């Protein structure tokens, strides 16, 4: 469901972005930094994340703490609808 | 008559609030009202504080006139006096009426001038009556605000720099003391000064960074308080704020700056550093001795080099406080009694000398020594007064200046002869700069057209000096009026210091 | 949702209901002809909701499977936020009308921002934290940019939006790591799993990401650079709002997160908070010396003061939280007073913001300068002002926790910061040649200066139970 | 000379550095935020998992 919802939402949203690109198109389209240092900080940050994910293991209590355990026999969209509007009703209204 | 200390503390502040509210008009009559209202207020505070002085019982070394009420953030509002702090209250209330009377010819923003001094008095009195650790810090630091503006608004040509140096230099030293007060609050679980006087702060050595801290926690607390009181006193070499602030302040500001605010540093040593950190004080005694001996010699020679009359007096104060510091840390009855006497005595003499500078500053609007000469020819009364306090400034026997100097020197002699020998040379050096200044300003021939028509001291100016001459002579001839009050309290203080020394 | 859940969130429903109804009333019954009326009904609504939150009998609890926490801590924070928001709106009403800035939607946008803040401080779940934070953040971007003819308003919104979105992304990335480790978004579940023997790099990375994301909202260094530009660019009423209510809500949220989700790893996050507090105190103090624009000076003042507030939180104790709460309360009062004066500054009928305009103001309007003097010494933390007692409380918490090194650094930075507050006093009372700045204040704006200024001294005598109320509130959070 | 050198020589010099770093460029401010997170992550890594 979130796979299909994501496409539906961002197909329209990305098209709107195209409208603003051409509305504010720069006058130098024909010929359209500290990149070296920036790439170094990006690589460092990516390496740190990779090291943290190397040893990833959830808490041994993670299974017992699940608020909305998934059911194999229930289709994904129905499962989300059973929790989205009742357990998460406060967040639903804030959205 | 049960809240006497609260009355004398907050009465001057309340009067300032009333004056700021219900006093209108900027004409001379409006200013004339402000001067009279301030004079009646300062006179009232002095009279009420005489009830404290005469009901005070010197034999009782506990705190008297004590009042205690609940306050904010878990602190208490507690005030009281003992034989060590009662006289600093009376000195403050004594100088304030005289200081107001000396401003009678100021025409610039008079109502605001009176308010600043009335607010300043209340805060100065609170420093000496407070018996709560945080309450002491409040009055200790709140006094910077009115004085910052007194220098800024009515000061000289360098007053912007002087006012900022005065505030920030003093503020820097006291924030370290604030953290020490918070630590003592947490260890002892109280901010009650009487309770902290009996608490035993740990003195076992530990290691902090790359050095051993001899004295342990007491030394760390001692150094925080020392930074606050050393700058306030001031001690050498943290004194270079004083020659700016005292010189650039208006004459009235210089009187209160030198006569009263300097005494907060020395009183701090007698209230906190020696009673609450005795082991640390014993350890620091050698260094305090030489800093004070250096201060006497160093600033005496610096005073001799000054071309500015007010700067000679400013540097003289730093030398006189050098005796106080030595006497306190000699930690014997003779030294500590001399230190207290020296503080009170210096209040009358230093204040008077700043008033002597103002008398001729008002007429000539300059402080250069070379701009005067032979003033005795036109100003006989001034030359007599200036001479008397010049002689008191050099510690002449018969004036109150001698007694404080003599006793602090003899108390130090008992401990360190090298220090006493160096400090004792101040008698030679004080005479040098004090007499040379007097001669160059007052004696000689009247050979300048500017000084040809100079007037003598007016009756109001003469009457400001007479109380100061009286106290200087009375205490010089009968110092027992002071030592009877401070005797028993210093005896108890000296005894506790001994009983706490490591064995 | 039970009827007990609905009762718990009733103050929030009342505020949300008002915002919706106000939107329709403004749209259908006059639009900007109701702008003034909607502003003053919003002020009443904020005060009414604060009365519901703060008055009567309250029993701590939770609603919606623990996602919403109604405890003494959240009630203390909500009241200060709502009253500070009410104060900013009331004192700015005349200014915005004169400047043709009062749209009927401005009160409503502020109300929805405050609604987001109310969910922030009562968060008991990562999703509640996010949705409350984002409702506030989106409303703040809008009002930052609401002066359409000002290129500086547009740039303030742009910088705030881009950097706010970046901080929100970091917050979400850490929140995703925390959920993956614990298997739940609820804080009661999270706290039980994050303990000494099970802290992988992954979960520690999550805490850092969440902390950095939130520390942006309190302008902690080096997540602060948005503040001076946004404070300068945005409308002065909007700058006054940014300086008081969001900072209180954001500071309380950080305390909620580190104690209700990371309360068993205090040692790990206390060091990070201390390092943020140190950098914020010194940079705010040092950078403030170089400011000539009063609005931009207040940003660095804001950064330095949040550093001091973080000192109380770095303590990691009930006393540290109690004193952080009092600090934020006093800080909000001081900023209301100061920004009341800043709004009034003007030369030739146009607003003015440069510090040189204050020269010799004390001889133009004695009472206003005297109020400004008390506020500057209160911000500098000098006795006898209530601002000093705020610093005293956080320093007390630090020393109490064995962090005297932090207290020593805190007081040293205070001395550097005291210079640029002293300089304002210098300008007003014995400054240089005056250029004719006048202070235009109506009755409400005038009281927004005097009453906070009086509170700085009256508060020195009695805090009227606020210090005791903060202690009870801190206990419900820390336990 | 020392007191003035610190109060009026050094601290103003640090003030000028702080003013300079506040360049006004949005991409610099984002860089600072990224340096902060990267530095804090280095700190957490040295302490280790524990
Ligand atoms: C006048 C000079 C004074 C002098 O020579 O002191 C003798 C000094 C007195 O010390 P003591 O009590 O006999 O025993 C010291 C032991 O170090 C015992 O030491 P201690 O165990 O008691 O602990 C150390 C104690 C040791 O203290 C001392 O007594 C030694 C150092 C004291 C300071 C030296 C003089 C400082 C400058 C004087 C200028 C005055 C103007 O304290 C100090 O170290 C004090 C250091 C000074 C701090 C002040 C510096 C401020 C900035 C400059 O004795 C000697 O060093 C031997 C005699 C040498 C005489 C030479 C003088 C030249 C001829 C005239
Ligand atoms: C405490 C609570 C008591 C109530 C507050 C009192 C407020 C005083 C007041 O009425 O306002 C200022 C007063 C009104 O004057 P106004 O009519 O505006 O102008 C004509 C006269 N100048 O005008 C004045 O009197 C102004 C006086 C200004 C102060 C003089 C400047 C020197 C500094 C004085 C001492 C320090 C004051 C600060 C102390 C607090 C520190 C935070
Ligand atoms: C970091 C904060 C500063 C740490 C201070 C520790 C310095 C120290 O050693 O303290 C004691 C010091 C010198 O005393 P000392 O001569 O070591 O005592 C004799 C037995 N060793 O004691 C003193 O110097 C006394 C204080 C001097 C005041 C100037
Ligand atoms: C209390 C209610 C506010 C009344 C304020 C009186 C001010 C009088 C006034 O002029 O404005 C009232 C205004 C309607 O404007 P009015 O002037 O009647 O319009 C003229 C037609 N062009 O009225 C308004 O601006 C109304 C604003 C909306 C108030 C919402 C009330 C509901 C509160 C939320 C409860 C949620 C519970 C769930
Ligand atoms: C109509 C009523 C108006 C709204 C008033 C709400 C009252 C809230 C209140 O009193 O809350 C109490 C709460 C502590 O509650 P608790 O600890 O339970 O107290 C014991 C009770 N048995 O107390 C608290 O939470 C403390 C709240 C303190 C608020 C301080 C002010 C915050 C900043 C705003 C400053 C406004 C400046 C003035 C502006 C002038 C005009 C512009
Ligand atoms: C002129 C000379 C000036 C020299 C600096 C003056 C010293 C300033 C020291 C301030 C007081 C700090 C202190 O006493 O230590 C705080 C703390 C003790 O408290 P603690 O034992 O943790 O009790 C917890 C309560 N439950 O922790 C300790 O035990 C000691 C921690 C020391 C913190 C650093 C002190 C550095 C000194 C300042 C350097 C200059 C700036
Ligand atoms: C190196 C410094 C000291 C540390 C020593 C540890 C070495 C690991 C450092 C990690 C930094 C490198 C980044 C990669 C992270 C590896 C994660 C890992 O090993 O996990 C176990 C894990 C094993 O799988 P598991 O058995 O299912 O857990 O490794 C993998 O195989 C993960 C595969 C990653 C997929 C890459 C997808 C690329 C998309 C296209 C991009 C363009
Ligand atoms: C302007 C200054 C106003 C006066 C300062 C306070 C004088 C305190 C004398 C006691 C007043 C009283 O009866 O209230 C008791 C009241 C409560 O304690 P109780 O005596 O146990 O009822 O205490 C106070 O009023 C304490 C106030 C201290 C304020 C000092 C802060 C400024 C320095
Ligand atoms: C969206 C923001 C605007 C909100 C304004 C309207 C508030 C909701 C509508 C008004 C009536 C709600 C009364 C609830 C009754 C109740 O508690 O019993 C439930 C009741 C059963 O509870 P019982 O009485 O305990 O059995 O259920 C029902 O039959 C009604 C269910 C209505 C669900 C509406 C959910 C939306 C409310 C939450 C708003 C989110 C916060 C906004 C910030
Ligand atoms: C506190 C007092 C210290 C205040 C100064 C702190 C900055 C230290 C230096 C770090 C940045 C180096 C690169 C920029 C140097 C400035 C220059 O001359 O170039 C002009 C230059 C402007 O050139 P333009 O923008 O190309 O016109 O400045 C920059 O390029 C800005 C650099 C942005 C990226 C680094 C951001 C670092 C954020 C620092 C936040 C504060 C954390 C440290 C302080 C904590 C308190 C203790
Ligand atoms: C060495 C240890 C530290 C000693 C510090 C002693 C207190 C400061 C004495 C000098 C202050 C100078 C005041 C200048 C007044 C003036 O003219 O301003 C107007 C004027 C401003 O321009 P205007 O307002 O247009 O006249 O000042 C300047 O232009 C100079 C700016 C100087 C900035 C000073 C701020 C830093 C000093 C306070 C903090 C010290 C922290 C020490 C930390 C280390 C502790 C170990
Ligand atoms: Ca003792
Ligand atoms: Ca908790």
Swiss-Prot record, chain A:
It comes from the Bacteria. It is found in: Cell inner membrane. The chain crosses the membrane at residues 1-21, 35-55. NDH-1 shuttles electrons from NADH, via FMN and iron-sulfur (Fe-S) centers, to quinones in the respiratory chain. The immediate electron acceptor for the enzyme in this species is believed to be ubiquinone. Couples the redox reaction to proton translocation (for every two electrons transferred, four hydrogen ions are translocated across the cytoplasmic membrane), and thus conserves the redox energy in a proton gradient. Belongs to the complex I subunit 6 family. NDH-1 is composed of at least 14 different subunits, Nqo1 to Nqo14. The complex has a L-shaped structure, with the hydrophobic arm (subunits Nqo7, Nqo8, Nqo10 to Nqo14) embedded in the inner membrane and the hydrophilic peripheral arm (subunits Nqo1 to Nqo6, Nqo9) protruding into the bacterial cytoplasm. The hydrophilic domain contains all the redox centers. This is NADH-quinone oxidoreductase chain 10.
Swiss-Prot record, chain C:
It comes from the Bacteria. Coiled coil: none annotated. One of its GO terms (cellular component) is plasma membrane. GO terms for biological process: ATP synthesis coupled electron transport. It is a multi-pass membrane protein. It is an enzyme of class 7 (translocase). Keywords: Cell inner membrane, Cell membrane, Membrane, NAD, Quinone, Translocase, Transmembrane, Transmembrane helix, Ubiquinone. It is found in: Cell inner membrane. GO terms for molecular function: NADH dehydrogenase (ubiquinone) activity; NADH:ubiquinone reductase (non-electrogenic) activity; quinone binding. It holds the Pfam family Proton_antipo_M. The chain crosses the membrane at residues 9-29, 37-57, 76-96, 104-124, 126-146, 161-181, 196-216, 235-255, 269-289, 301-321, 324-344, 369-389, 402-422, 446-466. InterPro entries: NADH-Q_OxRdtase_suN/2, ND/Mrp_TM. It catalyses: a quinone + NADH + 5 H(+)(in) = a quinol + NAD(+) + 4 H(+)(out). Its EC number is 7.1.1.-. NDH-1 shuttles electrons from NADH, via FMN and iron-sulfur (Fe-S) centers, to quinones in the respiratory chain. The immediate electron acceptor for the enzyme in this species is believed to be ubiquinone. Couples the redox reaction to proton translocation (for every two electrons transferred, four hydrogen ions are translocated across the cytoplasmic membrane), and thus conserves the redox energy in a proton gradient. Belongs to the complex I subunit 2 family. PANTHER family: NADH DEHYDROGENASE. NDH-1 is composed of at least 14 different subunits, Nqo1 to Nqo14. The complex has a L-shaped structure, with the hydrophobic arm (subunits Nqo7, Nqo8, Nqo10 to Nqo14) embedded in the inner membrane and the hydrophilic peripheral arm (subunits Nqo1 to Nqo6, Nqo9) protruding into the bacterial cytoplasm. The hydrophilic domain contains all the redox centers. NADH-quinone oxidoreductase forms a supercomplex with ubiquinol-cytochrome c reductase complex (complex III or cytochrome b-c1 complex) and cytochrome c oxidase (complex IV), which stabilizes the NADH-quinone oxidoreductase complex. This is NADH-quinone oxidoreductase subunit N. It comes from Paracoccus denitrificans (strain Pd 1222). The lineage of its organism: Bacteria, Pseudomonadati, Pseudomonadota, Alphaproteobacteria, Rhodobacterales.
């Amino acid at each position: 469901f979130v796979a299909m919802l994501l496409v539906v939402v961002y197909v329209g949203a990305v098209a709107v972005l195209f409208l603003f690109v051409v509305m504010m198109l720069d006058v130098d389209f024909a010929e359209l930094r500290y990149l070296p240092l920036a790439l170094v900080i990006g690589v460092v940050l990516l390496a740190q994340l990779g090291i943290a994910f190397s040893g990833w293991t959830p808490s041994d209590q993670a299974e017992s703490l699940r608020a909305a355990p998934v059911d194999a026999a229930v289709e994904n969209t129905l499962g989300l609808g059973l929790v989205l509007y009742d357990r998460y009703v406060l967040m639903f209204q804030l959205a | 008559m049960t809240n006497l200390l609260s009355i004398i503390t907050f009465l001057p502040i309340v009067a300032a609030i009333i004056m700021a509210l219900f006093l209108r008009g900027q004409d001379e009559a409006a200013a004339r009202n402000a001067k009279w209202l301030a004079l009646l207020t300062t006179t009232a505070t002095f009279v009420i504080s005489l009830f404290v002085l005469f009901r005070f019982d010197p034999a009782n070394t506990g705190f008297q006139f004590v009042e205690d009420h609940a306050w904010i953030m878990g602190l208490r509002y507690k005030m009281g006096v003992d034989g060590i702090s009662v006289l600093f209250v009376l000195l403050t209330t004594f100088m304030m009426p005289l200081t107001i009377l000396s401003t009678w010819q100021v025409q610039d923003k008079v109502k605001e001038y009176m308010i600043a001094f009335l607010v300043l008095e209340g805060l100065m009195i609170g420093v000496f009556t407070a018996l709560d650790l945080v309450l002491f810090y409040l009055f200790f630091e709140a006094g910077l605000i009115p004085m910052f503006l007194i220098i800024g608004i009515w000061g000289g040509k360098d007053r912007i720099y002087a006012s900022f140096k005065f505030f920030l230099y003093t503020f820097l030293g006291s924030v370290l003391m604030l953290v020490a007060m918070i630590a003592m609050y947490r260890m002892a679980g109280t901010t009650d000064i009487p309770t902290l006087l009996t608490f035993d702060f740990p003195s076992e050595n530990f290691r902090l960074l790359g050095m051993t801290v001899v004295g342990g926690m007491q030394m760390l607390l001692f150094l925080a308080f020392f930074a606050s009181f050393a700058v306030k006193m001031p001690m050498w070499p943290v004194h270079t704020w004083l020659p700016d602030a005292h010189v650039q302040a208006p004459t009235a500001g210089s009187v209160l700056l030198a006569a009263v605010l300097l005494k907060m540093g020395g009183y701090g040593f007698l209230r906190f550093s020696l009673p609450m950190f005795p082991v640390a004080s014993g350890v620091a005694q050698p260094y305090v001795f030489w800093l004070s001996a250096i201060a006497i010699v160093y600033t005496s020679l610096v005073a001799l080099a000054q071309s500015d009359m007010k700067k000679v007096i400013a540097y003289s104060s730093v030398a006189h406080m050098g005796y106080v510091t030595m006497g306190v840390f000699a930690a014997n009855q003779i030294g500590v009694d001399g230190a207290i006497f020296q503080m009170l005595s210096h209040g009358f003499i230093s204040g008077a000398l700043f008033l002597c500078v103002g008398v001729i500053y008002d007429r000539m609007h300059t402080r250069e020594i070379d701009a005067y000469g032979g003033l005795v020819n036109r100003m006989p009364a001034y030359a007599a007064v200036f001479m008397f306090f010049t002689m008191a400034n050099v510690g002449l026997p018969g004036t109150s200046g001698f007694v404080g100097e003599f006793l602090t020197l003899m108390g130090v002699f008992r401990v360190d002869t090298w220090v006493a020998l160096v400090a004792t040379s101040g008698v030679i050096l004080s005479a040098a700069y004090a007499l040379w200044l007097y001669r160059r300003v007052t004696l000689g021939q009247l050979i300048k057209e500017s000084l040809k028509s100079i007037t003598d001291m007016t009756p109001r100016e003469r009457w400001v000096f007479i109380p100061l001459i009286a106290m200087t002579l009375i205490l010089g001839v009968y110092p027992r009026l002071v030592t009877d009050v401070t005797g028993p309290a210093v005896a108890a203080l000296v005894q506790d210091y001994n009983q706490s020394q490591p064995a | 949702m039970t009827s007990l859940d609905f009762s718990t969130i009733l103050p929030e429903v009342v505020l949300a209901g008002y915002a919706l109804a106000a939107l329709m009333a403004g749209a259908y019954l006059g639009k900007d002809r109701l702008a003034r009326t909607l502003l003053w009904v919003t002020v009443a609504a904020f005060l009414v909701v604060a009365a519901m939150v703060g008055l009567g009998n309250h029993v701590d609890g939770a609603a919606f499977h623990g996602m919403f926490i109604d405890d003494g801590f959240s009630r203390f924070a909500k009241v200060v936020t709502l009253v500070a928001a009410a104060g900013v709106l009331a004192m700015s009403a005349d200014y915005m009308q004169r400047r043709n800035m009062l749209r009927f939607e401005f009160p409503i946008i502020v109300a929805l921002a405050v609604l987001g803040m109310m969910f922030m401080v009562s968060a008991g779940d990562l999703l509640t934290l996010y949705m409350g934070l984002e409702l506030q953040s989106l409303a703040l971007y809008v009002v930052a940019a609401m002066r359409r003819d000002s290129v500086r308003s547009s740039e303030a919104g742009l910088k705030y939006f881009v950097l706010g979105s970046l901080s929100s992304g970091l917050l979400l990335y850490g929140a995703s790591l925390v959920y993956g480790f614990a298997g739940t978004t609820g804080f009661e579940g999270i706290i039980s799993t994050i303990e000494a023997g099970h802290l992988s790099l992954g979960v520690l990375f999550g805490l850092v990401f969440m902390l950095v994301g939130l520390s942006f909202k309190v302008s902690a260094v080096p997540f602060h650079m948005w503040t001076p530009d946004v404070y300068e660019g945005s409308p002065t009423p909007v700058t006054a709002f940014f300086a008081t209510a969001p900072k209180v809500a954001a500071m309380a949220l950080i305390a909620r997160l580190v104690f209700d989700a990371f309360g068993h790893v205090i040692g790990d996050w206390s060091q990070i908070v201390a390092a943020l507090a140190v950098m914020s105190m010194f940079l705010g103090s040092i950078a403030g010396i170089g400011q000539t624009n009063i609005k931009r000076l207040m940003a660095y003042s804001s950064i330095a003061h949040m550093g001091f507030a973080l000192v109380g939180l770095a303590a990691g104790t009930a006393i540290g939280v109690q004193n952080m709460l009092l600090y934020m309360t006093i800080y909000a009062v001081m900023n209301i007073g100061t920004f009341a004066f800043i709004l009034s500054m003007e030369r030739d009928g146009v607003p003015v913001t440069d510090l040189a305009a204050l020269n010799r103001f004390a001889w133009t309007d004695p009472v206003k300068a005297l109020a400004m003097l008390v506020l500057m010494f209160s911000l500098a933390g000098v006795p006898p002002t209530l601002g000093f007692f705020a610093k005293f409380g956080v320093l007390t918490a630090a020393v109490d926790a064995g962090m005297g090194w932090l207290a020593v650094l805190g007081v040293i930075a205070s001395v550097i910061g005291a210079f640029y507050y002293l300089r304002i006093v210098y300008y007003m009372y014995f400054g240089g040649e005056s250029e004719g700045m006048t202070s235009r204040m109506g009755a409400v704006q005038y009281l927004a200066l005097m009453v906070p200024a009086l509170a700085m001294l009256v508060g020195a005598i009695s805090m009227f139970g606020v210090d005791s109320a903060a202690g009870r509130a801190a206990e419900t959070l820390v336990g | 000379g020392t007191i003035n050198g610190v109060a009026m020589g050094l601290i103003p010099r640090l003030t000028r550095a702080a003013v300079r770093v506040q360049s006004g460029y949005l991409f610099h401010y984002a860089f600072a935020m990224v340096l902060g997170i990267v530095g804090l992550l280095i700190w957490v890594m040295m302490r280790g998992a524990h």
